[PDB]
Amino acid sequence: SVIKPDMKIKLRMEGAVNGHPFAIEGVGLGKPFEGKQSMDLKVKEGGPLPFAYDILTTVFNRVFAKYPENIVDYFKQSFPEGYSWERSMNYEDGGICNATNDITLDGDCYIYEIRFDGVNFPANGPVMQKRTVKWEPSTEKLYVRDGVLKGDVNTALSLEGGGHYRCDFKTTYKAKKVVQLPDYHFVDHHIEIKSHDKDYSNVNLHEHAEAHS
């Protein structure tokens, strides 16, 4: 173990959605063994954001996830040197977002470098009209294909009058160090925005996650 029970987070995301650039910075902390984390986020450029903040939240580290005895923890074992991931997020109306995160460690602080690019969100859909309410709880499936750890999530956002908006994620995780193939498993997620100001310039975000099979 290189991993304390309390650990800090620092991050920067640069990105664009339908060609509008922005940048967000964040600081948080979590409990990697409990699978819990919370963070405060600040829009530094491009604010106030003209799209639903929820498209960002799953992009703002599977180190924060209660793994039992039973299963190889690929993420705790990647450190100190860390790991990166890539994700495409395909929404049901054709909106597509690509993101990457590079995760290093300095002391007890995880450092994230994030890029986030979304296109083809329609002007009258729920993202550009800010009609999303929250992501539902979800289950990620992790498995190995040709020597790389993958994770699929088929989930949906809840919409303001009732209704859901589907999104399928495909993530590829890449340790920078030979670590174990884990065996096929799941992680359950619950992400929530606990508070925010009026225009989402300031946001407080929480996640809790546990692995199982």
Q: Amino acid identity, residue 169?
A: F
Method: X-ray
Is 206 marked as binding a ligand? yes
Is 185 marked as binding a ligand? no
CA distances for 40 relative to 83, 88, 107, angstroms: 23, 24, 20
Which residue reads 């602080």 in tokens?
109
Phi, psi of 163 (to 5 degrees): 105, 155
Domains of the chain: 1-213 (2.40.155.10)
Burial 82-102 (b: 16+ CB within 10 A, else e): bbbbebebebeeebebebbbe
Interior CA angle at 174 toward 168 and 175, to 5°?
140
| Collapsed DSSP state (helix, strand, coil) of residue 57 | helix
Residues 206 and 194: beta-carbon distance below 8 Å: yes
CA neighbor of 48 nearest in space, from 157, 202, 194, 193? 202
Q: What is the resolution of this structure in A?
A: 2.0
Is 212 marked as binding a ligand? no
Question: Is 104 exposed, middle or buried, given 0-12, 13-18 or 19+ CB atoms closer than 10 A?
Answer: middle
CA distances for 117 relative to 13, 57, 96, 121, 209, angstroms: 10, 14, 8, 11, 25
Neighbours of 163 (CB within 10 A): 12
